[PDB]
Design a protein around this ligand. Structure first.
Ligand SMILES: [Mg+2]
Ligand SMILES: [Mg+2]
Ligand SMILES: [Mg+2]
Ligand SMILES: [Mg+2]
Ligand SMILES: [Mg+2]
Ligand SMILES: [Mg+2]
Ligand SMILES: [Mg+2]
Ligand SMILES: [Mg+2]
Ligand SMILES: [Mg+2]
Ligand SMILES: [Mg+2]
Ligand SMILES: [Mg+2]
Ligand SMILES: [Mg+2]
Ligand SMILES: [Mg+2]
Ligand SMILES: [Mg+2]
Ligand SMILES: [Mg+2]
Ligand SMILES: [Mg+2]
Ligand SMILES: [Mg+2]
Ligand SMILES: [Mg+2]
Ligand SMILES: [Mg+2]
Ligand SMILES: [Mg+2]
Ligand SMILES: [Mg+2]
Ligand SMILES: [Mg+2]
Ligand SMILES: [Mg+2]
Ligand SMILES: [Mg+2]
Ligand SMILES: [Mg+2]
Ligand SMILES: [Mg+2]
Ligand SMILES: [Mg+2]
Ligand SMILES: [Mg+2]
Ligand SMILES: [Mg+2]
Ligand SMILES: [Mg+2]
Ligand SMILES: [Mg+2]
Ligand SMILES: [Mg+2]
Ligand SMILES: [Mg+2]
Ligand SMILES: [Mg+2]
Ligand SMILES: [Mg+2]
Ligand SMILES: [Mg+2]
Ligand SMILES: [Mg+2]
Ligand SMILES: [Mg+2]
Ligand SMILES: [Mg+2]
Ligand SMILES: [Zn+2]
Lengths: 204, 46, 178, 134, 110
RNA sequence: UCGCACACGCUUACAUCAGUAACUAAUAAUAUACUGAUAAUUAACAACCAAUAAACCAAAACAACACUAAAACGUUUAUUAAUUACAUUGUUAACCCAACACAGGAGUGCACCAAGGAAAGAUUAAAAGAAGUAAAAGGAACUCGGCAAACACAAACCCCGCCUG
RNA sequence: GACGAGCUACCCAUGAGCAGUUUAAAAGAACCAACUCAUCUAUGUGGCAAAAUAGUGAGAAGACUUGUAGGUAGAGGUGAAAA
RNA sequence: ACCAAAGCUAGCUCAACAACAAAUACAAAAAUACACCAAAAUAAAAUAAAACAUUCACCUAACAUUAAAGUAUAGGAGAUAGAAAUUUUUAUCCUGACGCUAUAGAGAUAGUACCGUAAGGGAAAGAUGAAAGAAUAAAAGUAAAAAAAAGCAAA
């Protein structure tokens, strides 16, 4: 991870081509004011259903792709949209793609699953000690959007190659809590017998 | 005759006159280091 | 010597899958010999990855599944953590000296306070030449300089505060909260 | 092993041992033509000859006859936008030669095995936007 | 001597817009009957001289191949041939260069 | 026709492939000097590499033997010296000190070419300038002075310092 | 109060050069190269160069030139005195 | 029409309150052999006195605050320097700004480039947008648009 003191996040990954093009090595731009939201006060996640209250497209419903916490943005899939070409060569302009335009978190409310309405989500700690999101308006428990992971490896469908360790072996507890260190342990195990000892040494 | 070539590079003379050890041997050398740290120089001593 | 290379059938393929890197908890359960062995299974894989790295750089071709190199690092890094604990715990339980290498607190020439790591010499300290002309103490004039950085530091701290102050105000006048 | 303290040797001390070795090797395709008996390894800076020999023999079971080493100097000359120098790291290179008459060759690591729109404007249309039919 | 005063832009416009410092319009430009490119009346056509030059270069290469070394050069007259041609008796007893391209229209048989 | 090595000193400027619209070259072409990617100098040469006692008046100079100015440099005997494959490090260059890709400053060993290099971007043949060549008759008449230049290169007299420095 | 003897002045170490020709001679002798100086003239004067280039000159086994490394520091040093 | 021009932020002022690990003094960044360590002597002058010799506040210390008082005194009795005895003082809490916006405010985007053998000196700069995982035409100088007897350039 490479970051400068003044940096603008352009939907582009910090370590990427589009980003090195966006803000080259020598740029310093105006400050971007970010209304502070502490991590614990943050009520949004990627994958949950939200309602957009703002803009040309409002009152609609949508799923969240990813949240960028630095500049405080949420991403609704194919909802707020502007048009960007992909391939452009001299004689040809190919692949016109509808692209998601970023949305501020003031324009987006979290939708409670049952009656499908926008609400203010507030953190509650239950009697059992779980952290749940309770609707102020509707008075419900709001789930958080169990979602895939970045690598696209689903644990349920998986196969070991030659170099993958089978679960049974990796879990097996072989540890024998005795007072030796790795040196004396291995040396005793390998059957390497040492007799002569170190002469006295001074430390300055 | 023609001048301005006065500096004839030598690595031994350079370290012997301006090098870290030479500084540290004498009190005033030490203060050269000290002042140079107070100004926060990238290079303290030759 | 083939061990510097991937299984021959695996060369031209774009993506190659591998597992998760070892998490400490999985390593705590292994005995000493097992960690000691795992170390080399990790080592060889690391060399093979490294070689593929360089080679891919030379052939002007992007390198297949870079994730691997990240993973084999972590596990090794993990493995270390596990053994370091088992030493550092045990040495407490035996001696009660927290730090593994001998060491002292010194006032060096420049009046800083420093952690002096000891060294191992064949002869006593009063008989060692180099160790004798190393001075640990300060002189009178250093007292002045000692002051200056205390003063200099005090400014960088004092005017960092005054930045965090301003930041709070702008935001509050820019965002009429509540 | 790199970055570790070593015990000071005096007369009749225990044979020095390192249980988890700290070094790491790269096997690199030679930049110039060298005999069939030669392999080339970038090693870490602090590694001695004898170390590379034992390391190769015991980890990989290679019968090594001869080792030689040199130190490569990385350029100090490329400049940042701030006009401060970027230094490419210095690195040690070793040449090893195999004892039993074995011939090495560097494996080709990239076998090449893998897994038409013309919209061009009409010359006789004279710039008329063809989508529109009439 | 150092100039006594900055000159005004007026004086400079006078001096360097003079009808003498202006580039004259060349009136001798024509077109070449073959390739229809532009050429000056007294000068060879550039584009024609090009294809002539290229062909001369290639024929000199092949006649460099017909010669063994740097100092060795023929005592006979040379005659160059193209695909499909056989030597006349006038031209026999001479060194012959054989070429793939069928004889170019501008180069005659004679 | 200041050539190839080493010492000192510079630090990748060196090598291969690729690109040069524009940056470096005081212009272009193309590239040892710009840009990117990749590589690279391998130790037998060189650096690092014991002490203490005792004998020993007797120059280098082609060294016979001397000269005055009196000359750099170690053998051998004794007492102990870890004894054990492979230590570590320098190895490119068209280069360095002069603000410059400076008609300049730079130690040593062998060389006079076997090695290195181009004095002219294209014309035109004005003046005035710079450098060189030749000149009828005259030969210092020039000028502060025979300064400069000569197909000359020699003599004599003074003043002041004695002399080489 | 610091920092400067990598230039230059003078020393102290440790190295290195000096071909030929003449003379019984290495004799602060001749002649003349390398090497060292800087006489005289012309170019140059924001130069090729913050002191050069071309010719022409002096010395050239010595109070000779020169390499590496030390030393003396401003109320001072060093000086075959030119303040 | 070129060259240019405009933003408001980075940060500053002033004031209250009170990443290890290894490597390092060998010629710093070099694991490793016989030593030595370590040291101290008033501040001077520039300047005031219209010159300058005695003398010249502040420059070290803390002592603060309201007074006694610019008084007693000390001074080429000049310039100027200058006390004390004795008196006064209610708590914290309560932070900010008739302080600067990129020739300002820190030297600072930096003690960095670069300049110095060395102590040491010491810069310049940023600007579109919600999103680039969407592509005003106003300084001088010039161009559009050479110049026609005459003369502080105008009236
Ligand atoms: Mg200079
Ligand atoms: Mg080595
Ligand atoms: Mg080597
Ligand atoms: Mg060298
Ligand atoms: Mg150019
Ligand atoms: Mg060296
Ligand atoms: Mg060297
Ligand atoms: Mg070389
Ligand atoms: Mg110069
Ligand atoms: Mg010319
Ligand atoms: Mg003329
Ligand atoms: Mg003439
Ligand atoms: Mg003549
Ligand atoms: Mg005549
Ligand atoms: Mg006369
Ligand atoms: Mg006359
Ligand atoms: Mg006369
Ligand atoms: Mg004359
Ligand atoms: Mg007279
Ligand atoms: Mg005389
Ligand atoms: Mg003489
Ligand atoms: Mg010295
Ligand atoms: Mg000297
Ligand atoms: Mg001689
Ligand atoms: Mg003589
Ligand atoms: Mg002449
Ligand atoms: Mg002479
Ligand atoms: Mg003479
Ligand atoms: Mg003298
Ligand atoms: Mg005198
Ligand atoms: Mg005088
Ligand atoms: Mg006065
Ligand atoms: Mg006055
Ligand atoms: Mg006066
Ligand atoms: Mg005073
Ligand atoms: Mg500023
Ligand atoms: Mg420098
Ligand atoms: Mg204008
Ligand atoms: Mg008028
Ligand atoms: Zn033509």
């Amino acid at each position: 991870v490479t970051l400068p003191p003044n940096y603008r996040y352009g939907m582009s990954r910090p370590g990427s081509l589009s980003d090195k093009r966006k803000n080259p090595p020598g740029t310093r731009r105006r400050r971007v004011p970010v209304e502070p939201i502490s991590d614990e006060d943050w009520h949004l996640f990627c994958g949950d259903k939200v309602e957009i209250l703002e803009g040309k497209d409002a009152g609609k419903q949508g799923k969240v792709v990813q949240v960028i916490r630095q500049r405080n943005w949420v991403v609704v899939e194919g909802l707020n949209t502007h048009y960007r070409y992909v391939g452009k060569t001299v004689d040809y302009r190919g692949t016109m793609i509808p692209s998601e335009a970023p949305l501020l978190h003031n324009q987006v409310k979290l939708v409670d699953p049952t009656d499908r309405k926008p609400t203010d989500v507030e953190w509650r700690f239950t009697e059992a000690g779980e952290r749940v999101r309770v609707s102020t308006r509707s008075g419900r428990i709001i789930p958080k959007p169990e979602f895939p992971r970045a690598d696209g490896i689903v644990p349920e469908t998986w196969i070991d190659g030659p170099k993958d360790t089978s679960v049974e072996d990796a879990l097996e507890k072989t540890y024998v809590p005795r007072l030796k260190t790795l040196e004396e342990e291995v040396m005793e195990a390998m059957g390497i017998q040492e007799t002569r000892r170190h002469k006295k040494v001074y430390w300055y | 005759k023609a001048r301005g070539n006065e500096y004839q590079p030598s690595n031994i003379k350079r370290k012997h006159k301006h090098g870290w050890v030479r500084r540290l041997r004498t009190p005033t050398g030490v203060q050269v280091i000290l002042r140079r740290m107070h100004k926060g120089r990238k290079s303290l001593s030759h | 010597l083939e061990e510097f290379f991937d299984d021959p059938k695996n060369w031209g393929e774009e993506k190659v899958k591998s597992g998760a890197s070892w998490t400490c908890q999985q390593l705590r359960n292994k005995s000493n010999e097992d960690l000691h062995k795992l170390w080399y299974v990790l080592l060889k894989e690391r060399n093979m990855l490294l070689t593929l790295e360089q080679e891919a750089k030379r052939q002007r071709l992007p390198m297949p599944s870079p994730e691997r190199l990240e993973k084999v690092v972590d596990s090794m890094d993990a493995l270390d953590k596990v053994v370091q604990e088992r030493e550092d715990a045990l040495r407490l339980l035996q001696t009660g000296q927290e730090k593994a290498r001998p060491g002292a607190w010194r006032r060096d020439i420049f009046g800083r306070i420093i952690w002096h790591k000891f060294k191992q010499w064949p002869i006593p300290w009063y008989l060692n030449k180099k160790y004798n002309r190393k001075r640990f103490f300060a002189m009178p004039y250093v007292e002045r300089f000692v002051r200056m950085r205390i003063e200099k530091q005090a400014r960088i701290k004092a005017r960092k505060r005054s930045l965090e102050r301003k930041k709070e105000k702008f935001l509050q006048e820019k965002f009429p909260h509540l | 092993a790199r970055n570790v303290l070593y015990p000071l040797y005096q007369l009749g001390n225990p044979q020095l041992r390192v249980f988890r070795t700290n070094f790491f090797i790269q096997l690199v395709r030679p930049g110039t033509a060298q005999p069939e008996d030669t392999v080339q390894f970038r090693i870490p800076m602090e590694m001695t000859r004898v170390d590379l020999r034992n390391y190769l023999e015991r980890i990989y079971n290679v019968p090594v006859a001869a080792v030689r080493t040199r130190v490569q100097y990385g350029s100090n000359r490329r400049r940042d936008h701030r006009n401060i120098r970027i230094k490419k790291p210095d690195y040690k290179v070793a040449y090893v030669q195999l004892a039993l008459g074995q011939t090495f060759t560097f494996p080709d690591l990239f076998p090449e095995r893998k897994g038409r729109q013309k919209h061009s404007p009409d010359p006789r249309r004279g710039g008329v936007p063809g989508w529109f039919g009439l | 001597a150092a100039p006594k005063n900055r000159r005004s832009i007026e004086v400079n416009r006078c001096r360097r817009r003079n009808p003498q410092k202006l580039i004259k319009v060349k009136n001798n430009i024509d077109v070449c009957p073959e390739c229809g490119h532009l050429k000056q009346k007294h000068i060879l056509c550039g584009y024609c001289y090009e294809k002539v030059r290229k062909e001369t270069a290639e024929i000199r290469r092949q006649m460099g191949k017909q010669e063994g070394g740097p100092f060795r050069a023929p005592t006979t007259e040379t005659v160059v041939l193209y695909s499909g041609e056989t030597p006349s008796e006038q031209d026999q007893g001479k060194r012959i260069i054989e070429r793939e391209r069928k004889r170019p229209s501008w180069f005659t048989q004679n």
